[PDB]
Amino acid sequence: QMGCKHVKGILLYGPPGCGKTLLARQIGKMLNAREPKVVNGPEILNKYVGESEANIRKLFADAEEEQRRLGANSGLHIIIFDE
Amino acid sequence: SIINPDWNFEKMGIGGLDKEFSDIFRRAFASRVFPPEIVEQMGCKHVKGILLYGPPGCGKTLLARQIGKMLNAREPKVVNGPEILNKYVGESEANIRKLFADAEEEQRRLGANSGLHIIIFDEIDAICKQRGSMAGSTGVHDTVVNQLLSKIDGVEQLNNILVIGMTNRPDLIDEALLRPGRLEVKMEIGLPDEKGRLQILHIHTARMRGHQLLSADVDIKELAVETKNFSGAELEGLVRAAQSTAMNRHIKASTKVEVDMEKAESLQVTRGDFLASLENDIKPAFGTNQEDYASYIMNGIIKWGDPVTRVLDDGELLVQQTKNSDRTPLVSVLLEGPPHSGKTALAAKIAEESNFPFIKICSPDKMIGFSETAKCQAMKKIFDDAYKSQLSCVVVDDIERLLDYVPIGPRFSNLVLQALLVLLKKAPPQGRKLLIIGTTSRKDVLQEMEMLNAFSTTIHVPNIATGEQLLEALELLGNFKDKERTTIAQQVKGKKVWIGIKKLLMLIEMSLQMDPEYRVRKFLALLREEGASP
Amino acid sequence: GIGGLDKEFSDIFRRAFASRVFPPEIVEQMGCKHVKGILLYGPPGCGKTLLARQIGKMLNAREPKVVNGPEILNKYVGESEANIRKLFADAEEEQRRLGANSGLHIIIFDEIDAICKTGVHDTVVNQLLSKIDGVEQLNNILVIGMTNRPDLIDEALLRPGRLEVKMEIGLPDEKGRLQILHIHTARMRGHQLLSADVDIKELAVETKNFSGAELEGLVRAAQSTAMNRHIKASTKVEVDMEKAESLQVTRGDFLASLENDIKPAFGTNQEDYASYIMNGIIKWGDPVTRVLDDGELLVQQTKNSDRTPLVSVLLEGPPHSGKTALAAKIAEESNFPFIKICSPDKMIGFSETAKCQAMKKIFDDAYKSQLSCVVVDDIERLLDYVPIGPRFSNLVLQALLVLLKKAPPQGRKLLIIGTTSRKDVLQEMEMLNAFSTTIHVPNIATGEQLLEALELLGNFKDKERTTIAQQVKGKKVWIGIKKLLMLIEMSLQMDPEYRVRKFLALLREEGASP
Amino acid sequence: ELEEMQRRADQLADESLESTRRMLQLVEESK
Amino acid sequence: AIFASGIIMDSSISKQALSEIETRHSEIIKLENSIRELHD
Numbered sequence A: 001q002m003g004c005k006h007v008k009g010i011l012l013y014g015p016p017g018c019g020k021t022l023l024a025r026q027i028g029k030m031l032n033a034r035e036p037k038v039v040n041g042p043e044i045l046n047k048y049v050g051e052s053e054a055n056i057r058k059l060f061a062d063a064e065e066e067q068r069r070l071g072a073n074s075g076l077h078i079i080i081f082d083e
Numbered sequence B: 001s002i003i004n005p006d007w008n009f010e011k012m013g014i015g016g017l018d019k020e021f022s023d024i025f026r027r028a029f030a031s032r033v034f035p036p037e038i039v040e041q042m043g044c045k046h047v048k049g050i051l052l053y054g055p056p057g058c059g060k061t062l063l064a065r066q067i068g069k070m071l072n073a074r075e076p077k078v079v080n081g082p083e084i085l086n087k088y089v090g091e092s093e094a095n096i097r098k099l100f101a102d103a104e105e106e107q108r109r110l111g112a113n114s115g116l117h118i119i120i121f122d123e124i125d126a127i128c129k130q131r132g133s134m135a136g137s138t139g140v141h142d143t144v145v146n147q148l149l150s151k152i153d154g155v156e157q158l159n160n161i162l163v164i165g166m167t168n169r170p171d172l173i174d175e176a177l178l179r180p181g182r183l184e185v186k187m188e189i190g191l192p193d194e195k196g197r198l199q200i201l202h203i204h205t206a207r208m209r210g211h212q213l214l215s216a217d218v219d220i221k222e223l224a225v226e227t228k229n230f231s232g233a234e235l236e237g238l239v240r241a242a243q244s245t246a247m248n249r250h251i252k253a254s255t256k257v258e259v260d261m262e263k264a265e266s267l268q269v270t271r272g273d274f275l276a277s278l279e280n281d282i283k284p285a286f287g288t289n290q291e292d293y294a295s296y297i298m299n300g301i302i303k304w305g306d307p308v309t310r311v312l313d314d315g316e317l318l319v320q321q322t323k324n325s326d327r328t329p330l331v332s333v334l335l336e337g338p339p340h341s342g343k344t345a346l347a348a349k350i351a352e353e354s355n356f357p358f359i360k361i362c363s364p365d366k367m368i369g370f371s372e373t374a375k376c377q378a379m380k381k382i383f384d385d386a387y388k389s390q391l392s393c394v395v396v397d398d399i400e401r402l403l404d405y406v407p408i409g410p411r412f413s414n415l416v417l418q419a420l421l422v423l424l425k426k427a428p429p430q431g432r433k434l435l436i437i438g439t440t441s442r443k444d445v446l447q448e449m450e451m452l453n454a455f456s457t458t459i460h461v462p463n464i465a466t467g468e469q470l471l472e473a474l475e476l477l478g479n480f481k482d483k484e485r486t487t488i489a490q491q492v493k494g495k496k497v498w499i500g501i502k503k504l505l506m507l508i509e510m511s512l513q514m515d516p517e518y519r520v521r522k523f524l525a526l527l528r529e530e531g532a533s534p
Numbered sequence C: 001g002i003g004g005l006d007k008e009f010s011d012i013f014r015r016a017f018a019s020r021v022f023p024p025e026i027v028e029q030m031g032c033k034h035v036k037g038i039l040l041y042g043p044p045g046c047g048k049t050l051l052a053r054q055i056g057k058m059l060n061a062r063e064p065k066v067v068n069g070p071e072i073l074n075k076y077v078g079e080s081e082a083n084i085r086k087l088f089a090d091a092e093e094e095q096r097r098l099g100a101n102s103g104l105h106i107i108i109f110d111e112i113d114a115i116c117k118t119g120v121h122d123t124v125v126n127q128l129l130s131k132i133d134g135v136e137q138l139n140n141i142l143v144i145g146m147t148n149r150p151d152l153i154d155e156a157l158l159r160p161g162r163l164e165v166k167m168e169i170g171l172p173d174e175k176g177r178l179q180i181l182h183i184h185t186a187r188m189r190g191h192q193l194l195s196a197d198v199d200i201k202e203l204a205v206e207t208k209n210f211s212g213a214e215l216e217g218l219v220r221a222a223q224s225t226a227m228n229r230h231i232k233a234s235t236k237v238e239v240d241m242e243k244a245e246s247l248q249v250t251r252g253d254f255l256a257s258l259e260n261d262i263k264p265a266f267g268t269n270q271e272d273y274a275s276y277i278m279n280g281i282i283k284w285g286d287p288v289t290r291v292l293d294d295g296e297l298l299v300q301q302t303k304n305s306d307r308t309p310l311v312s313v314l315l316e317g318p319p320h321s322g323k324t325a326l327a328a329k330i331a332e333e334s335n336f337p338f339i340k341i342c343s344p345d346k347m348i349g350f351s352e353t354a355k356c357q358a359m360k361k362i363f364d365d366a367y368k369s370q371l372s373c374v375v376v377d378d379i380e381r382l383l384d385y386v387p388i389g390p391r392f393s394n395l396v397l398q399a400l401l402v403l404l405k406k407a408p409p410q411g412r413k414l415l416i417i418g419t420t421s422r423k424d425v426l427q428e429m430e431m432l433n434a435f436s437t438t439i440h441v442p443n444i445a446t447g448e449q450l451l452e453a454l455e456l457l458g459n460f461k462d463k464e465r466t467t468i469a470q471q472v473k474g475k476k477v478w479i480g481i482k483k484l485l486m487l488i489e490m491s492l493q494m495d496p497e498y499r500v501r502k503f504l505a506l507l508r509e510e511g512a513s514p
Numbered sequence D: 001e002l003e004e005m006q007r008r009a010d011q012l013a014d015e016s017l018e019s020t021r022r023m024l025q026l027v028e029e030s031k
Numbered sequence E: 001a002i003f004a005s006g007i008i009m010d011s012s013i014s015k016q017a018l019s020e021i022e023t024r025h026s027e028i029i030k031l032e033n034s035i036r037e038l039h040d
Ligand SMILES: Nc1ncnc2c1ncn2[C@@H]1O[C@H](COP(=O)(O)OP(=O)(O)OP(=O)(O)O)[C@@H](O)[C@H]1O
Pocket: A015, A016, A017, A018, A019, A020, A021, A022
């Protein structure tokens, strides 16, 4: 009825040694959803032209497919960007 | 016709883009209004270029998709970023040709009655780059640009394609292409106003009013006035944050996630939540106009004698003179007085009392450790910024500290002095006005350099001289009892006093640290020690 | 066909056709060289193509070769050089068949900078250079190219004997541009879609830095505005549908459409001088007449002089006496082909080197004319000066002293005017000797002059003027014109009754004597 | 996709070589 | 430290090495059948 949209972005920052990667892990484990994806730094870069973009696009394929298939009543997919 | 019957201004929910939308419609669909007979009689070509650019959070994508929806024809084709580039050689040109092949074939088959097709480009700057300005690695970029240029307008010409592109860095686009016939119309999108803010807020609050989810204490006009320099995205985020804050008031956490299931229909949003969200959650991103006055005015202003009123009246008179005059578009004055007299506070108050659209303050506090050339560039940039608006007031405080002046030698900087002298008599462009107010504490030094003559006039800012002023200030502060006040008076009436307001405040606050039995004597001793002055 | 290049046309004729008329035998025996290198650069348009065709047509040669941009380039390698050898195969065959007197081959390039300026670029450049000039001799090669970045060409093409002709393209004129507008609008004129009240003559006259693209764009904007006149949009997509039978476009709509849609691209320059004169000049006394007469005498001496091609004058006076305005007025009245003004405002924060470079550039630009006048104002602010020390920049002073005694090329004149408010400082620096003479600009001395100036301004009525004269006539006054206007404006703020008292008090406070 | 097509082309080339060898052997026997 | 890394564009797949390779082999079937019949 309110016609509101959910937030889809969180950023954490601070000096070294306080608990960012613990908070992220706990948040990922808390939700009763599919296992989250993880990216370790610039692990998506590649040598052959036009492969980094394909790697980035492959991340969101499942979410788009679920949205298309089950419409609004769909699950939640978590993506964790490290560094 | 080519326009869907459902078109309507409200249905798209756009904000303060009335003029831009009207211009777009006029210059991109007018030729499509009259029947074929008249347009053929004119025998004129059609528009084949549209490019929308502006800062983030403006609504380019929303406008583009609304325009696409409004058009009644085949589903417009969409390119989602730079996905055209592929590794096997020759695939970028294949895809770009495959993009227009359907339109080419349809127009060829249908002759001169072909339908209208439009393609939506997202992140245009990614694919097209200046051919001359580029590395010599491989040319998967130059070939794509050349193929696109040939396709849009080559040997064969087409009149059923319109290119629409959204970008954020217009200078990165290639200049050789943005010419008539390919990209002729180019518009600039800025920031909405209070009217647009009100309209946008109403658009986003429609559902709650429809279901009466907002309490009567909500005032759209007051909210719009409060938020300044915001954007549509910021307004939507603020509304969402306020809704979330209001909704959170029926959740118990840290033990078990539970909700009433019965009080959920008693939810409402108040104003206090709106201010809380505005002050704690949202913060403006596009520049700012928060000329912090609490920092400069940390204790307000208290009327302790005529001089404050006289200074305020003189400032008001000067402001009126500059506002309602044309023979002297540039007018400036100088504020000077003994140390610790509150010159900067009075200057800031005088500047704030004016309702000029653009008010800025330049102080050395920001330039700490800067080189001997950065200061000139900063002042030039500030004065250039202040030139744009019709009316503007600039306050230069602590002049003596802006030249590095020191009484040994003496030493100072010539370049900054020359820059300030030149910038203090350059008249603004035609049909504009400007005001400059300066502060300082050494009239003789400025006189020696022959810079005081440039200023039109000066205003004196004296300090407490008589005891009766001290008693009035103490009464205004209300930091003593009747007996203590009488005791202090019985001594101060003996002779005269000379102490600035800031020094007086510091002395009283230092004296307030002793026990009640000794506060008065310590205060008197401190005043006597510091009162050694004419 | 082409104007403004008659002498340049003769020069090109001598450069090109001088070595071609002679029979090949005598030239070969003597050993003379040939001219086969031409390059072009200028504003985009038909002028380049017109010049190329005019040059090509006169020669009794076959059809020239024209390439539109990087046509040779392809997706793969080897295509760029495939056409180069095919084009010159016929030239080589003709050279080997007819010998020395072989049919001329002409090559024309469009936007060659795209291919000549990463193996593709250098390979193409090397192939083109080898084909144009190499071990094999080609006596029938003519090359013409048009680019907007001539200075970016490779060093190899700059070798002597490869690029011997330097030329610049012309600019649109009033009659030619009028013809272009006529050809464009012939369609509407035949269809009677243009109102008879529109004049194209003054419209073309006022155009500055407008090319064909700009013309077609503003024409299209005018057509769109005419289409909109009948339309009733901004409320719906429905219109009258009846007024279309009668339609015409007034010149006002043309101006409105073309003045807020497009603007010139290739820069925009103007000689705006009103910025230095905000309130004109009012004759408040005799000295201004004497100053103007002296300026006119100096101008006529410079114009008619033969032994002294360079003459300089110095303007002197107290501060706030109106020196820059008088110099600007004199310069404007001089009516010389080239006039420029150098002020410190344009250079804020610039170091000594930048100021010296700017002064040198401005003087070099002024030199190239036949006769011009240059005015420098606020000399002290030009070479930063401070009474403490004292301190100043020596480089700028030396540059000024050198430039104040340098004659221009023989057969040209020049005039220099300087304004300043410190005679003693300049005299101590040993600069006042260079200037030929000096002029003075006094302030308001007698109260009668002040009353006359006030009457000319017309800001006070007779009743107040009588009292002011009675109070001030019995005393001497010393006030500057700019300060006088500032004081008058300040006093005008208050009510009509208290103006006199405040004005008199302010004048008394500002009063001073020499 | 493309790799499968290249593998099929290589297999076709191998089959062509085998056919040529069989042709040569058959003609030799026929002699 | 003037230096720069590089990006690659493969070509080991040619879309024109599938036309001739397939057309070339399509004609030997008749010859093989004819020679088999001749030998039989
Ligand atoms: N609030 C906390 N409570 C308990 N452990 C904590 C807390 N903050 C940090 N830690 C400790 O942090 C360790 C993991 O490192 P952590 O994820 O905090 O580093 P980080 O913030 O990712 O550092 P970096 O800036 O290098 O990424 C764990 O062993 C955990 O004990």
